[PDB]
Amino acid sequence: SNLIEVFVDGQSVMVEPGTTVLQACEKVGMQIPRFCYHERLSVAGNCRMCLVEIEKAPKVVAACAMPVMKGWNILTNSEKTKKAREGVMEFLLANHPLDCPICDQGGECDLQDQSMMFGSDRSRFLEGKRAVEDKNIGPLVKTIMTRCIQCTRCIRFASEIAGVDDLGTTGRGNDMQVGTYIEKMFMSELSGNIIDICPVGALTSKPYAFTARPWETRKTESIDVMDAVG
Amino acid sequence: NTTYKNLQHHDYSTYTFLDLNLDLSKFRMPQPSSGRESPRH
Amino acid sequence: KVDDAKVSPPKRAEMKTSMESLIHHFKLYTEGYQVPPGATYTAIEAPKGEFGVY
Amino acid sequence: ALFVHRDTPKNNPETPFDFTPENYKRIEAIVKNYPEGHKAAAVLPVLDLAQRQNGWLPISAMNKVAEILQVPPMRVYEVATFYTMYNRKPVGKYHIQVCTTTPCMLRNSDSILEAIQKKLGIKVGETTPDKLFTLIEVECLGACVNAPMVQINDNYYEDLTPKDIEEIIDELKAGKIPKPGPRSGRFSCEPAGGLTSLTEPPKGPGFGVQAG
Amino acid sequence: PLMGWASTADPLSNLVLTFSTKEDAIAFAEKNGWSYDVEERKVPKPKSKSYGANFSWNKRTRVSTK
Amino acid sequence: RFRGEHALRRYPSGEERCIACKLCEAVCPAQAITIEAEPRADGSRRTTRYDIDMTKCIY
Amino acid sequence: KTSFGSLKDEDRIFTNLYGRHDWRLKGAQSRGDWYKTKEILLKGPDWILGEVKTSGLRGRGGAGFPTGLKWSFMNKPSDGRPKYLVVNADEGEPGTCKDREIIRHDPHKLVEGCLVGGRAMGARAAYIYIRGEFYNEASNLQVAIREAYEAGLIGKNACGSGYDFDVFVVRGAGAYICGEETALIESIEGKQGKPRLKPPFPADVGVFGCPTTVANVETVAVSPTICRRGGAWFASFGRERNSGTKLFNISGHVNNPCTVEEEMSVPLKELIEKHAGGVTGGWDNLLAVIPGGSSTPLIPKSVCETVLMDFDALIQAQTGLGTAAVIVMDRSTDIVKAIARLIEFYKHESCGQCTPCREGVDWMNKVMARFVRGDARPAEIDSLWEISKQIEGHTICALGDGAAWPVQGLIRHFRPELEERMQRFAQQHQ
Ligand SMILES: Cc1cc2nc3c(=O)[nH]c(=O)nc-3n(C[C@H](O)[C@H](O)[C@H](O)COP(=O)(O)O)c2cc1C
Ligand code: SF4
Ligand code: SF4
């Protein structure tokens, strides 16, 4: 009754019609890596890590926004799947400079974990590594847009949950600032909620900015106060 | 007949395009709407 | 050493120059390289004897 | 190219900029072409109108467009950053755009660039030491069958050479416009040689048609 | 008071035990004889969002920027 | 290549070469390194407290 | 059959090619527009679609898909949302020179063709998206559609129908990827130039969500003669896998480069010399050939001596087939320099949705600059082959793909001249 067959590495599982391939593959357990898909957001097409080969096909589709056709059989661990991932991961680490000590998501990046688990052991490409003057947003959010990967995730959060429309992609080619064109203070509600979303250390907290590191801390379950939601 | 039949276009100021589609706005089927006029109302 | 930066740290020149070497350096020393699960046993002839580790 | 605004008065709103109710009549034409419910498509032609209403567009122009078209201005700033008509920094009245990438370099745009360089004086991308001769060079326009070419504000100059360079320099110093026509022979895109192309004046409508 | 270190009288405050189910968790916790608090495995919401549905005609699901 | 004294260095006529990036505690096996890092007044990131236990250090 | 020959007259599409005879509504009426046309209107679009799919029409614009299959996608059942024909009047791909001449001479052919297309699929309106670099001939198009307006012949009561079909013109704001298939659509929408992902198709979701179709202006301009002429007369021009008269133009470096209309299969050397002067300094004075345009790899001499101008035969020659930069370039200067300028072009005009074209065009530009200076090592140039293998098939649009092809072709054919360049740089550094 309205389910679709897919094969994740040959294994059959049943699909509600209209979902993405990425949702089914993380239904069966395969945590396919990603940089712009986000479950609490709409789907852009900028991550490019979501590529995966499916057989009987000349080329490789994106698994982020592909509706489930009938009877799939996906190659999540083929040769050219890992070759495409090694490609994209080698591309991302060009214009993201050597600030991994002085980062603020140093324990909790995503280029870190996914480049250790998918990327290349050696790199190439001596020159390049372009730089951007950091903008200002407000004295609550510290903003270093050199480490930004232009992944268009802050923008979707702004124009959906904030709706304030302050963040913009300006420029072309390589040079594409994610920022406010007019140096206007983005100081409204939920402006503090963007920092758990920018997956690199581009957007970060201002008072916390240079204090500690995630491994030394420890988590503890707790309840919000001062508000009726908790 | 080897005559440059063009350069009727020789006399375009800055306003000719917008004003041509302006002056040729009549007899127009009215470009139908869809509910709202924007995302918001 | 081995030429497998996902096991050993890179050398210091490629560390201080390029990017992936720095990331592998940093999270290799912090996070520690992952090891696949399983049990093993080995031993060498230490001059005492069969020094084994499980 | 310095896409942070860096307010710099002679800019930095309020900057004086306003329209005409006749230009409002133009805006009525623009949002009457587009179907209702998707009004946000008029940002591109209204900002086109703003550039042809004032030479370089200020930030207050875009803010006024946001004030008319009832959208927040950041999308207007995006569209102004992306495209290549909208020289946001103040330029002169005329504006030289030497179209030169692949066939133009191949047919000596270097001589064209150096001729403009040594008669106007200034380098690439710079402003002239007056107004109204600001020089840049640009990508292809579409007359790759022609020579290296020069676009001035809404006008062509095709099929150039250093004597045409001297012509266009001295005659835009002569106030008026010269013709935009293809210079130094071949008065359009024309086979000026053996000319094995079509030689018959047209057939007329009533030749062999079908399914009538 | 000499170096500014975090010192405590807590031997068992560095424990974690990794399990695979809840029944054996409760069984071991009472097997060693102590009270305990059980919580929920709060799964994510099952969604189905797509690119063309984000690019509709009349609906307000309209990203206005991409 | 002898291993000795545990000194901090600095730049050539410059600031403290440490950044408080906590790697030395992250790999210090006896965990003798204690780091607490305030940023200083001039915006750059720095320390408060960088401690070694010579009792604990295995060199 | 023949052995595919060349072209003789009346196989040509329209008169007034090169600054010639006429332009007016009366000029177009005297040349053949608006003739036997309501009898095509009141017949049925399945007949038009069968004639399109029978006439062997190849989709111009560098996509290769035949048009009748795309328009068969366009036959979605009728809903509460209209269907549109977008006419992609941009001239991207430096070399193309294509419909600037069409709009300079015969806009009423475009009127005929958009009438054919919108009548072919239950459509409602058409949108000419012109390049913003074409302002004067854009207002020529405005005056011509004004002549058709005051003709009482388009729009409401087109020849006596109760089926109206208007065209609106949108200019470009000045970009390159607006030529492409869907950044066009979101540049129409008011968003900036940004393409779209594939599974929502233009035949499914297009201009603001309504299904629509982007059509090349050559296919639109040849489309009304498909209606008013005989059944698959256009199919008798070339093979039975591809068909049609193609607008073969020599940009670049010959004696007096210019544009001709020819058939499909023509010998390339005879195309060059018999139609635009000749090769300067002798036929053996060439360095190489590019067919296709700015987005097609180079072809050397000995390959194209036997291989003449065919789609599938240039696929066999490991390239594509496109338009109007079917040029040679000279042994005087360097195709290394020219391709470096080409990569500078692709860098200065490309959007940055896909990370691979962004970062790859960055590396390839810097590596070509070091090639022109001769700086690098041969391992780097075969790694450039490696990265260009890693780009082709990882994007949204095809502009990174069109960046990736020419460096592959250059690494195929002109390897040792690059080697000697690097060798003499090692001497000068030495
Ligand atoms: C790099 C690139 C440049 C393009 N430039 C143009 C252009 O200048 N004009 C155009 O009509 N289509 C352009 N296109 C889009 C395709 O040619 C598209 O197929 C065409 O608009 C319609 O082709 P069809 O008639 O086969 O449907 C471009 C596409 C790419 C990838
Ligand atoms: S966000 Fe950038 S600087 Fe921070 S850890 Fe990741 S790659 Fe390094
Ligand atoms: S600022 Fe962060 S969330 Fe926004 S595009 Fe850049 S990396 Fe993505």
Ligand code: SF4
């Ligand atoms: S925290 Fe430790 S590893 Fe990091 S810079 Fe300071 S001394 Fe070096």
Ligand code: SF4
């Ligand atoms: S390949 Fe480049 S220009 Fe094309 S859609 Fe992707 S990011 Fe844009």
Ligand code: FES
């Ligand atoms: S999820 Fe990032 S593009 Fe598919």
Ligand code: FES
């Ligand atoms: S590059 Fe100058 S005309 Fe195309």
